[PDB]
Design a protein around this ligand. Structure first.
Ligand SMILES: [Cl-]
Ligand SMILES: [Cl-]
Ligand SMILES: [Cl-]
Ligand SMILES: [Cl-]
Ligand code: NA
Ligand code: NA
Ligand code: NA
Ligand code: NA
Ligand code: NA
Ligand code: NA
Ligand code: NA
Ligand code: NA
Ligand code: NA
Ligand code: NA
Ligand code: NA
Ligand code: NA
Lengths: 60, 61
């Protein structure tokens, strides 16, 4: 979908993208739909990593 | 922050992570607060790409 910038942003890394308030962007739906996550075991320890659907997750 | 899975999920690709309803996850702000975006010019043309904090963005209306 299409988005507008609300505030100026200064990138810190080369991969980040600086912009100004009012700039317009295209963002693919997949960026909101997929999250890299760490699965925790019953003791709260990391046991797996991978992409999971954002919307299969709820705040704990 | 921590999250809970609402339904079982079967990964389709190697990079996806299978899980069960009720599993608990850590998801970093450095992951989910950022989207890869394409900056556009006034004619709708793509002019730059990179990670942006998505909460600095509002859907256009
Ligand atoms: Cl998101
Ligand atoms: Cl993906
Ligand atoms: Cl990653
Ligand atoms: Cl585009
Ligand atoms: Na800023
Ligand atoms: Na993705
Ligand atoms: Na949901
Ligand atoms: Na929050
Ligand atoms: Na289920
Ligand atoms: Na599934
Ligand atoms: Na994926
Ligand atoms: Na996997
Ligand atoms: Na992200
Ligand atoms: Na693009
Ligand atoms: Na113009
Ligand atoms: Na938000």
């Amino acid at each position: 979908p299409k988005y507008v910038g609300l505030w100026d942003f200064k990138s810190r890394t080369d991969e980040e993208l600086s912009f100004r308030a009012g700039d317009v962007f295209h963002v693919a739906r997949k960026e909101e739909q997929w999250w890299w996550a760490t699965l925790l075991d019953e003791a709260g320890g990391a046991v797996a990593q991978g992409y999971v659907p954002h919307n299969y997750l709820a705040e704990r």
